[PDB]
Amino acid sequence: ASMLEAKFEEASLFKRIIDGFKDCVQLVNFQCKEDGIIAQAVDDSRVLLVSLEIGVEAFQEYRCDHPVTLGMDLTSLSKILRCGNNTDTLTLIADNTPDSIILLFEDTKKDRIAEYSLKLMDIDADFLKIEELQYDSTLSLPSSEFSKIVRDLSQLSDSINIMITKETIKFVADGDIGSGSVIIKPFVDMEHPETSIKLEMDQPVDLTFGAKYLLDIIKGSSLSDRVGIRLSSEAPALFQFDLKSGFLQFFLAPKFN
Amino acid sequence: ASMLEAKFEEASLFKRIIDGFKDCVQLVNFQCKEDGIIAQAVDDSRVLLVSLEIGVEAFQEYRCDHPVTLGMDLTSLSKILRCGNNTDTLTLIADNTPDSIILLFEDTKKDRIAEYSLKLMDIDADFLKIEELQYDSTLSLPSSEFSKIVRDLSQLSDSINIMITKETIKFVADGDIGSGSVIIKPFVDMEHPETSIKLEMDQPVDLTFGAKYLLDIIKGSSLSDRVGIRLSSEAPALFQFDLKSGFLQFFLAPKFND
Amino acid sequence: KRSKENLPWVEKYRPETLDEVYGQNEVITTVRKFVDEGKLPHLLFYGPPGTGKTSTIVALAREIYGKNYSNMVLELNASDDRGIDVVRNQIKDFASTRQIFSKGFKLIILDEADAMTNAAQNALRRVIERYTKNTRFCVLANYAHKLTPALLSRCTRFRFQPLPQEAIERRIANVLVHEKLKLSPNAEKALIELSNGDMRRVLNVLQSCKATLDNPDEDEISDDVIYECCGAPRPSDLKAVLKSILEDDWGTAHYTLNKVRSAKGLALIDLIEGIVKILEDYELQNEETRVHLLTKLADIEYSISKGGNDQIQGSAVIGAIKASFENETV
Amino acid sequence: RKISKLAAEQSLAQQPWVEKYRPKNLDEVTAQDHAVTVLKKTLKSANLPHMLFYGPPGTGKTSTILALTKELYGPDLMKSRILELNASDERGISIVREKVKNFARLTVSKPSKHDLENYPCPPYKIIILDEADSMTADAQSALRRTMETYSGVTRFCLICNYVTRII
Amino acid sequence: TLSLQLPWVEKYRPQVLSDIVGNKETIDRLQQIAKDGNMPHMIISGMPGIGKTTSVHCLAHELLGRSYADGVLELNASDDRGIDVVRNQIKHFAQKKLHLPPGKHKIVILDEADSMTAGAQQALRRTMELYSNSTRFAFACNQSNKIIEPLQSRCAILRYSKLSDEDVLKRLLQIIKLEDVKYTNDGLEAIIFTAEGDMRQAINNLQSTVAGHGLVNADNVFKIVDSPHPLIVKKMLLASNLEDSIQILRTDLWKKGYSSIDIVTTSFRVTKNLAQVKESVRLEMIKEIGLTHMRILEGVGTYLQLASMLAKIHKLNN
Amino acid sequence: DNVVREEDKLWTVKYAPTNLQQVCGNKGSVMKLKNWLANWENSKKNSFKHAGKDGSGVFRAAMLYGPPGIGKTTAAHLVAQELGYDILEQNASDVRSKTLLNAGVKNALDNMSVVGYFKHNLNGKHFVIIMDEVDGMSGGDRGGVGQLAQFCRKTSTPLILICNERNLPKMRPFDRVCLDIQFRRPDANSIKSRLMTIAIREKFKLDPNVIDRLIQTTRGDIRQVINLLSTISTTTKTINHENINEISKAWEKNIALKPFDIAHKMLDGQIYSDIGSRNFTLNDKIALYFDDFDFTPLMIQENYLSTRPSVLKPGQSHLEAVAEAANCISLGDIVEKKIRSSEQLWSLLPLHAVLSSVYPASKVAGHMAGRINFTAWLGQNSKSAKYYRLLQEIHYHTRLGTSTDKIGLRLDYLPTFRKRLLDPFLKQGADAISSVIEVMDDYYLTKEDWDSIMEFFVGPDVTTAIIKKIPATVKSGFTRKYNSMTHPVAIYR
DNA sequence: CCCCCCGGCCCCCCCGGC
DNA sequence: TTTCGGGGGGGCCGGGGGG
Ligand SMILES: Nc1ncnc2c1ncn2[C@@H]1O[C@H](COP(=O)(O)OP(=O)(O)OP(O)(O)=S)[C@@H](O)[C@H]1O
Ligand SMILES: Nc1ncnc2c1ncn2[C@@H]1O[C@H](COP(=O)(O)OP(=O)(O)OP(O)(O)=S)[C@@H](O)[C@H]1O
Ligand SMILES: Nc1ncnc2c1ncn2[C@@H]1O[C@H](COP(=O)(O)OP(=O)(O)OP(O)(O)=S)[C@@H](O)[C@H]1O
Ligand SMILES: Nc1ncnc2c1ncn2[C@@H]1O[C@H](COP(=O)(O)OP(=O)(O)OP(O)(O)=S)[C@@H](O)[C@H]1O
Ligand SMILES: [Mg+2]
Ligand SMILES: [Mg+2]
Ligand SMILES: [Mg+2]
Ligand SMILES: [Mg+2]
């Protein structure tokens, strides 16, 4: 009960992080090292990749003797985490050659201790290397607005087209019942910078993606007020939500031209 | 409409009482006597016994000329009870050797009346006097906390183990995907006595119960903010919720330890 | 439900203790010994209607648990849902949990188990095996072919015989004492004969006979009363019909059959059954006679079961008997 | 348009003779005394058993049961004390297990003062299963314990032409 | 009395592979597998009460030991075994991480697998294939034909034969010595004869006879165990004189309370299995028996119909 | 990290093929599939309209089918990996209902692979959708079988479907949408080297002469052969002729026969002799019926007149035995009606087996004189149902004018309607059109009713040739005139 | 005031002997 | 093909609870 000891001062953060991508990937390998936690998971369709980084600063008393790998099913983890409380502190305990991990919910005001054990999964998924790439379009927009547009357009077509040109962003969805379009332009306000839609377009872009994948991606909006979308000519689109000391990234492969 | 007439100032109260155990038992014999109303029913699986008592003080008016037994189907009674509003008085009316029970919802302010009838049934179940027992352990805690513990542990396993030892109560559940264990210790608060967790142990206790039965039992948390639990090795576990002038009790048999 | 006197006699005289079950002495003795020494196994009561299976199991439950046996046992019958889901949830929960009231073992009574589905019977196997330390099963049936071999493998079998003459006589005596009734020896013999080993028939017929008497407090139940209430032929009528068939010409036999039936409006099927009973005792020189009799009379009974022309059926009975008995000469 | 409702007597007067002269009481049943006497004694004994009427067409079984129910309860209480099911109704095993059982377990309808003063009013109700020989064997088996368990408040009457069809 | 004596079928249920009698070669194969591990997927089939569940449980226990509670998942007909269960619970168990000795695997025991639905069986295929490096599957059933061919392909077939009278006698003698039961040779012979190769039935009958009468002789055994009615039916059908067959029918079957439907069904089965009679004669007999069976199902179940059936059979045989 | 020792693995995994050449048997099918997947890109470039020498260029989906344990999944994965595609695999363990299919793999038919992009072949970024165990999905519409058939027509990426039974009704939607590739049971010669290598590696003695027997035990199931070797070698380290018979009998694969095989076996005279009946018992024959109780009686009734019997009793002609068999078949039909009644007397199924199949077969058992034919009763029943529906429609169109039932309409009215509707065209040409229409208007008959009426007649009054012989101008004018007027309606919906 | 979880009908497909 | 009845599996609908 000493090899790995990672304490979140609030159990709500980890639960929210898991809920951010629990509807897209089932089995996930968490690699815990002295620098923090990193996870990479491929969806069943093999077109959506989820990457998660949690830094030590996000924790309270992070400690890792040697690198460890924990394979967990997100359904069981979510079921365990729903037994906690936001005020409660959540400590993850793992030992050498662990067949299970211990989740400890502690309450400071009271003397109530809740200890849970989660059986680890044997996962043999390969780890892919994502090298830094220079995209031709980068737009930062409010997460709520992006989710609203995605949900509105998903009601018409199974696919959504994103077109980026000079100070102009267009989301189109054409299906059988009808068609819908949404147009935005960059805007900044000193009084409310958090709503400032920012666009940097090195070159014009035009891509198409599946509605279900975007609906899964927008579930991370509860973690960050803003969302950053990076698009290249013929490369996967990157949807990033920033955390206190980590990130949640979704690499979505587009539909073939 | 003379032999039995009982008035509830708020029908919501009776609706809550029925909802407390309508998911446990289906067919119930309500015995109405001059001192009030009492019901006792054993579920189909014969694992859980529900015992309800309501005194005269719970009623604005109460008059029962002679003892009468009314056999009812709880689903039908709940369907009729959900018809009433929260601003209406509820009168239960029965005659001599009745074949039906009349429920009368009244709204004097709006001068509105709603009368429903429920046909009675011939239930050949005799009330079994539950002899008082000296339990090994007796504890009491807020209803919400116990309900949260039960709902959290029921996700992991179909059986929940309750163990009482010196100033400590442990709820454990071991299942296919993992295990869970919750520790609670006795404690008293003078600023919030309603949140106090009280324990009194004469002997240590260790019992196991089915999760579904506990999930049904915790539905009585809407009648009382606290719940009492009495446990013994050789006796069924007693979960009691206290009403203003009565009580609702669940006697649950533990699983065979083998 | 104002009093037990308002019940039909078949229910008013239901045995309440093992001492009130007659005609099954071996089974009662064995089960009582099992209970006395605490060696009760899983039981299978197999037998024909109205022999005392349900009565015996209820009395055994009362003996084991007492007056409050109803809340201490799990009884399921053909009027209840007993699908595989019920086995998986209700029976399994009852078998795996302690008694609410006492610390004794648990009893599950599957009355009329021959009406249970194959899937439920298969699901019962591991429930019976796993919880045998604290639970016992009783299965009651009239048709053993509806029970899976696996279930029969796990049960100890007791066969309820058709009730013997002495048991029916004793129960009739008890009923006569209770009801303040008078019964003639010939009427009693006829009642036993028509009972066919079923106590329910005896009780129903006796109740009808009492209802028939003008003054039941003083009038005695004679065989005439029984034959009138049941609308059954007298032995003399059967003898006369058979004698006329076997001795007289066709005109006389037809006339005698019609007259005998019209006297009291007898049914042809009752005459056929009585004549078959009589003929079973007859010693026949040729097997062909018996073969023809059995085949033709079975065909006639099957035809009657679907209706048809009564007069033609009676003539067919006469002709079949005559043709069959013509084989006894050569 | 609309037509003024006809009186019961006038309606029956212009009915076919078979319906017009249907027996109205047990005394009008012609040649079934061996059973009608037993049934009549129940008006005083109040211990009516479960009944199985069987016989060829047009012998008076349905008329007999209707007249018995009339004599036992009265025109006011009959409807509340009788449940009739025949070959024109649905009588599957589910129906037997739910509707028939539910009616059998109910408390008997309350007689009025006039009903008590003018009719025997026995403390049980009657379930009539006319043309019972059309019911399947499994549905019949579903009735076995229902008949015995609720005999204190319910009595069954099965009517048929072919008695062999009854298990 | 509110106490129960533990049945001997449970008290003396074999706990090791060496205590199981019959099917010697398969038992030795199981012992060797348990020795060296590397247990493959297997399907064990056979008739009731011959030691299939016992064999599987003993193998699992001897293979796993202290890790039995964590490395065994048991499902039978009394548990939920739908396609959802296969896709979630069994898959989670197969994917679960568990440190085991160098030659051991997790075990899934699907008892009474013949009752499983085709959908669940289909879902089991790739679960078995993908996770075979850590999990192995043992099916136990009575009718292996109910197991779909793709599943049979992935498993090792073990067909259990019926127990001979010698093995049954050996086990009964062991139990008798352990219980100090007083017996006579005729009593044990009767118990074995009535058991018909079912060890569970034999032990249950022995215990019932001891409880009800103490001494295990012929008389007490036959009082507790009734002579199987199929043999009586065979004697009825093989009789030479119609009068003898009718006498057997009336005295040994009808007066004992055996139902007509049971009698006719048993007659059909016995006639089908009557290898001593020419097949064509058996076919005619079956035609007549089927006529009688249809009549009985129609509602005319009477002694006269059965007697007519016997008369027709005798007429055919002459 | 902990790895698994090769000694811990099943022999089937330890010796699974690693490349396409190690696959034993079915070389032609493997080459066909490989070439199809190699030229799929070119086929796409041509819009899947140009067929090559093999004719596989017009199929966007391949469908591999064969018996269990022959190398279907192995070959599919090997071909997918060899050409460098990214594999997206689905099986019976996954939910493939219509809803999941549309919400799942449907979006991957024209989508790039993130794995194929982060692992960089030019096809690496493209998917190969492998749907294994397609026969393991239940349902008619909610199952998604028709949905997969629809997917097979518009997929933008290669799609390979695998099943065991290609001829099941559920497979009907895949009639002519995919390139069908059949995998057959591999013979002993194609595998002998594999088993000998496994034997020498595993250190147990195996005699080659029994390999043919071993395969016969497993019915060509290589996986079952390997399992048998692994299980038997645990205690018997030498496999020879001294123990082959017992092993074969203990491990024999007992598969249910198909209707043609059932008919062939049941009608063989040998099994009805004393020795044959002692070897193949009556119980075995009843079980053979129960292999397919729905189709066996139809097969027997179809083929019981096409035999040369060898079981004829002295003085008995083939015709007399045929008559006895027909009588028994009629009795079996009565029993079948009893079984499927409201009483649901399924307990009569064994009796049916005797009356419908075993008894008549025993009466006419022998050698099949010609080919075994599939039952013609189902098609005739469907045709009769169609004709009865048409007759009912015609009757209720003409109900207002006629006085008869539908049977009377067919037997009596129809010939006169033929004389007053068809004959005039053959005598007066176009001049009769009006009259015919008049008659139709008098009976509320439509053009479709006219054709249906003409379709009923049999024997000398067949109309097909006569109708075809009518001049095309007359028929065109008839249609024009009927469409140029207003007509009444017998039934207003 | 609006969204999500999860109990309950409802529909549709498939055996039915040993 | 298909005349009840049981069983299973998947789809919506809607109550309740939470935010
Ligand atoms: N051995 C018996 N002794 C006394 N009365 C009996 C006996 N058997 C039957 N009866 C009478 O008939 C009635 C019915 O008896 P039951 O025990 O229900 O017979 P049963 O064998 O259970 O009938 P089935 O199998 O459900 S048709 C009892 O209430 C008794 O009044
Ligand atoms: N015993 C009878 N006494 C007087 N009228 C009778 C008698 N039997 C039949 N009828 C007359 O025929 C009519 C029909 O009598 P029902 O009682 O319906 O006979 P049923 O036996 O019920 O006929 P089935 O069995 O339904 S064909 C009555 O309305 C009477 O008019
Ligand atoms: N070969 C055996 N050796 C010793 N006891 C046996 C043997 N077979 C059966 N028994 C005894 O009978 C009891 C039941 O054996 P089981 O293993 O349950 O038979 P089974 O073949 O699994 O029955 P089914 O197929 O589920 S009906 C065991 O606990 C033993 O006490
Ligand atoms: N042609 C083959 N050559 C060598 N081994 C084979 C061959 N076919 C099957 N096997 C062996 O059996 C194992 C399973 O082969 P599979 O490819 O799964 O056959 P399959 O036709 O897909 O069986 P199904 O349809 O899933 S029941 C392989 O790993 C091999 O060990
Ligand atoms: Mg009974
Ligand atoms: Mg009538
Ligand atoms: Mg078993
Ligand atoms: Mg495969």
Write structural notes for this entry.
- This is part of a larger assembly, with two copies of chain A, one copy of chain C (330 residues), one copy of chain D (167 residues), one copy of chain E (318 residues) and one copy of chain F (493 residues).
- In chain A, the strands form three sheets. In chain A, strands 6-2-3-4-18-17-16-10-14 form a nine-stranded antiparallel β-sheet. In chain A, strands 5-1-7-8-9 form a five-stranded antiparallel β-sheet, covered by helices on one side.
- Chain A is mostly beta strands and 257 residues long.
- Chain A has one domain.
- In chain A, helix 1 runs antiparallel to helix 2.
- Chain E has three domains: 163 residues, no CATH class; 64 residues, no CATH class; 91 residues, no CATH class.
- Helices cover 58% and strands 8% of the residues of chain E.
- Chain E contains 16 helices and five strands.
- In chain E, helix 2 packs parallel to helix 3 and helix 9 packs parallel to helix 11.
- The longest helix of chain E is centred in the last third of the chain and has 19 residues.
- In chain F, strand 3, helix 6 and strand 4 form a beta-alpha-beta unit.
- The termini of chain F are far apart.
- Chain F has 493 residues and is α/β, with parallel strands linked by helices.
- In chain F, helix 8 runs parallel beside helix 10 and helix 13 crosses helix 16.
- Classes of the chains: A mainly beta (257), C alpha/beta (330), D alpha/beta (167), E alpha/beta (318), F alpha/beta (493).
- The interface between C and D is medium-sized, with 31 and 35 residues.
- Strand 9 of chain A pairs antiparallel with strand 13 of chain B.
- One magnesium ion (MG) binds next to helix 3 of chain C.
- Chain F binds a DNA duplex (18 and 19 nucleotides) through helix 13, helix 16 and helix 17.
Overall SS class of chain D: alpha/beta
Overall shape of chain D: globular
Number of helical segments of chain D? 9
Rg estimate of chain E, integer Å: 24 Å
Number of separate helices of chain E: 16
Helix content of chain E: 55-70%
The number of distinct β-strands of chain D equals 4
Number of separate domains of chain E: 3
Report the C-alpha radius of gyration of chain D, rounded.
Answer: 17 Å
Global structural class of chain E: alpha/beta
The side-by-side strand order for the widest beta sheet of chain E comes to 2-3-4-1-5
Q: What best-fitting shape of chain E do the alpha-carbon axes yield?
A: globular
Beta strands of chain E, count? 5
Q: Identify the bound ligands.
A: phosphothiophosphoric acid-adenylate ester, magnesium ion
Largest sheet of chain E: 5 strands, parallel
How many independent structural domains of chain D? 1
SSE series of chain E: HHEHHEHEHEHEHHHHHHHHH
Give the largest interface. C-E, 65 and 57 residues
Q: What profile does the largest beta sheet of chain D have?
A: 4 strands, parallel
Helix and strand element order of chain D = HHHEHHEHHEHHE
**Biggest sheet, spatial arrangement of strands of chain D:** 1-4-3-2
PDB class: replication/dna
Keywords: REPLICATION-DNA complex
Entry title: Consensus closed state of RFC:PCNA bound to a 3' ss/dsDNA junction (DNA2)
Chains A, B: Proliferating cell nuclear antigen
